[PDB]
Amino acid sequence: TQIGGMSLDQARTQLAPWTQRAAPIGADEYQQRIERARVLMRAQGVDALLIGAGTSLRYFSGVPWGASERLVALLLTTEGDPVLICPAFEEGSLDAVLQLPVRKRLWEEHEDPYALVVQAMDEQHAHALALDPGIAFAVHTGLRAHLGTAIRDAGAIIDGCRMCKSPAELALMQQACDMTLLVQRLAAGIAHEGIGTDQLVRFIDEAHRALGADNGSTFCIVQFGHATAFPHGIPGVQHLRAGELVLIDTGCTVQGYHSDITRTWIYGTPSDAQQRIWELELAAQAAAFAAVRPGVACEAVDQAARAVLQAAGLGPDYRLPGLPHRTGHGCGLAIHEAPYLVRGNRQPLQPGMCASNEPMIVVPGAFGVRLEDHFYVTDTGAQWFTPPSVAIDQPFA
Amino acid sequence: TQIGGMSLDQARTQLAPWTQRAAPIGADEYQQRIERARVLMRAQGVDALLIGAGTSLRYFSGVPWGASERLVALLLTTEGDPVLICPAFEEGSLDAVLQLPVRKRLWEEHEDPYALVVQAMDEQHAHALALDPGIAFAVHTGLRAHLGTAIRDAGAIIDGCRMCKSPAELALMQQACDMTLLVQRLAAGIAHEGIGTDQLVRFIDEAHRALGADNGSTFCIVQFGHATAFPHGIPGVQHLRAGELVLIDTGCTVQGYHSDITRTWIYGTPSDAQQRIWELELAAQAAAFAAVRPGVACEAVDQAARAVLQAAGLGPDYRLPGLPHRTGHGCGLAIHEAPYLVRGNRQPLQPGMCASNEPMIVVPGAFGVRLEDHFYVTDTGAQWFTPPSVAIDQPFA
């Protein structure tokens, strides 16, 4: 009853604007994020931090622009006011989206914005710069035209801020997750024999828009049959046949905060192998979740999932049939961010950290089954953002 | 008659799949691109080049993936086989998109992919590394765990390849341009009193999808009235009134190659100020185009536009009312790429180079007019991809 049987008009009935709307991040929280960065900067012996346009600029200042070839950045020092370096011609647009008071340092098109960075450093007597690791290497080149000191990687500082989500961030992610879960459920409902992956992609986009996502689907991967064996996917449109597994990974954003949910369900009658592998996926996901509480090493969450698969005769390690990639990854203002649930990572989990749990099983040459639901770490355990699937033919709890 | 008066039914009649489809880039062209890189590498004293996932990896190998936190990269040496460094789990998906034969070096999730880069360099005795300036700084960090030799900026090498488009690249851009130009024309047609910016965005996205773009609109800015004064825009939805200028900047991709066209037209009767400014924009754009031929400094193209505006009493330089940003930028597999039509840039134009021509006039507190059409440089002049607008109330030639 969850797979097939829903008409488009039945689906549309459940597609009004979301009414449980989480609050936007307020200016006081942006200030707290800045202050936190300053504490981590001082602990690392860093007195200047340069953040580039993108998810980290959005985190510290509210500016949601993507990175471009023009330097738009926030320079934070240990004690000075933050400085926002920006093309002069963009100031009006900047003013409309900035949520944080900053000094602006504007540059005209032929001027050197890197020199403005280094002058702001000099004014504040700052010598030890850490640079956003997501920023384009070109910024390194521009900075090095003016600075002779070594430029450090700002990852530990930025992760140290972003990894633990506040109550307001959690609620914005919760909203996105709730919306996406509904859309996943509606997509399974409208599926039928012969439906195209492209029709599902369009519907899912439309549904996410109707509910009030920032911009429809952030992405959408739909895979039928053998294509489900490819964790990243394959080009091409497909049409649904009985006996095929269907894997749908999609998500949206609410105020930039991401959902990212994967469901794998059977259309028609599953093989014994499909059923067996499906349930082992659910079990591995459950085992990872049960390992989650404060103080647990990220690698131990991955190993919990892996150990279930090994016991059942899959793997070991990354061997197929089995789990060829990590159990999960962090999520927030980016789709992938720290912390990473991966062998070798000793990062301890802490309250407020968010991460996917998606220990995909790939059966080489045959199919794959991926269940993905995110969780956050609580004071004494873990909270699912979305409840996990129940059966191969019941994708929704 | 171009503005208003078209129903959605009339517009849909013109929205069948594009039938004049340019050919995909072939395997020999990818090989030519690699060879060209090697020649430029040698002229710069560089014997290793690392290209990250994104537009440049797509250019050299066909792989279209976006950059992620996982290193996906092409290492090219002077004379060795190109090496593709890739997560092991992604190999099957990689094989399905790679258009260039390479030696794969696969890394498991807990392994260090930077160690593979440096091993491949060591085997080839290649230690003068240049790094893709579009690649995340993080790569610098990873590399520095293994290499103490210099890590150079690869911009001159990459631009040296990508700036001059081949006949097949030009034809793919031409397709995207033709498709977008039609979409722009239809959007003007369907406009009417009270229409929302948001409705024009949706329609343009749907129209690009119908014509067979890679993924709808790449982007879309629609501005009415006072909002046309913001080159990059402002949040919010607007509704059309007579006497407002309407600015629409949008584009799509075909096989990753970009269109990007801006039209500015009057809904209703224009003021004398709007008319006057509109025609000065057309003139400045025309003046830039007439300066284009091989050997001309990019900055001279900018200056040609600026000189017209100054003669008419606007500017000077970047002063408003006038032109607050550069006259244009290069375009290809990225929306913005070399060469930049900007004061200070002495890069000579050469056959096959592609660039926008959009010397926008902003009248502060009032409105802006941007016309954007792209051209390529020919052996003896310039070729418009799209013909420029004719009048304030005739946006299409």
Automatic annotation (TrEMBL), chains A, B:
Positions of the Creatinase N-terminal domain: 33-164
GO BP terms in the entry: proteolysis
Residues at which Mn(2+) 1 binds: D249, D260, E372
Signal peptide: none
Residues that bind Zn(2+) 1: E69, H336
Keywords from the UniProt entry: Metal-binding, Zinc
Pfam families xrefs: Creatinase_N (PF01321), Peptidase_M24 (PF00557)
Superkingdom, taxonomy of origin: Bacteria
MF annotations from Gene Ontology: metal ion binding; metalloaminopeptidase activity
Keyword Magnesium: no
Every Peptidase M24 domain range: 172-379
List of residues binding Zn(2+) 2: E90, H232
Binding site for Zn(2+) 4: D260, H329, E358, E372
Residues annotated as binding Mn(2+) 2: D260, H329, E358, E372
UniProt: Zn(2+) 3 binding residues: D249, D260, E358, E372
Protein name: Proline dipeptidase
Organismal lineage: Bacteria, Pseudomonadati, Pseudomonadota, Gammaproteobacteria, Lysobacterales
